Amino acid sequence: ADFEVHMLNKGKDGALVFEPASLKVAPGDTVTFIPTDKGHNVETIKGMIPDGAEAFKSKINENYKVTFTAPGVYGVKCTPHYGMGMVGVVQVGDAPANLEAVKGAKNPKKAQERLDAALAALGN
Ligand SMILES: [Cu+2]
């Protein structure tokens, strides 16, 4: 199945957001990151993807379809707006084995609050 994630200048959780900011998918599902507003992209965050998973980084304003395979939690960011809090989490499967590594990684304040909220929204 395919899921859109919208790259937004603002949304219900405020300024510079992925919507949804948390999403649980199955292996083989796709997430299509939509450049709903101009100036955004998507990139995996250092240290925040499962063992054996490929990192990825899209171009700004690119409609970017990612296939997820390896189970676990994936921290994602918008490259230009990471420091301003533009982040999300995609979780593949239940009971993510890399949860503590993901929770432990240091991020700027705004980003960390939204990562933590997304992990909590996913039941972790
Ligand atoms: Cu952005």
UniProtKB/Swiss-Prot annotation:
Binding site for Cu cation: 40, 78, 81, 86
Cofactor note: Binds 1 copper ion per subunit.
GO molecular function, one term: electron transfer activity
Compartment(s): Periplasm
Keywords assigned by UniProt, alphabetized: Copper, Electron transport, Metal-binding, Periplasm, Signal, Transport
One GO CC annotation: periplasmic space
Residues of the Plastocyanin-like domain: 5-93
Cofactor(s) in the UniProt record: Cu cation
Protein name stated in the entry: Pseudoazurin
Part of the whole protein covered: 29 to 152 of 152
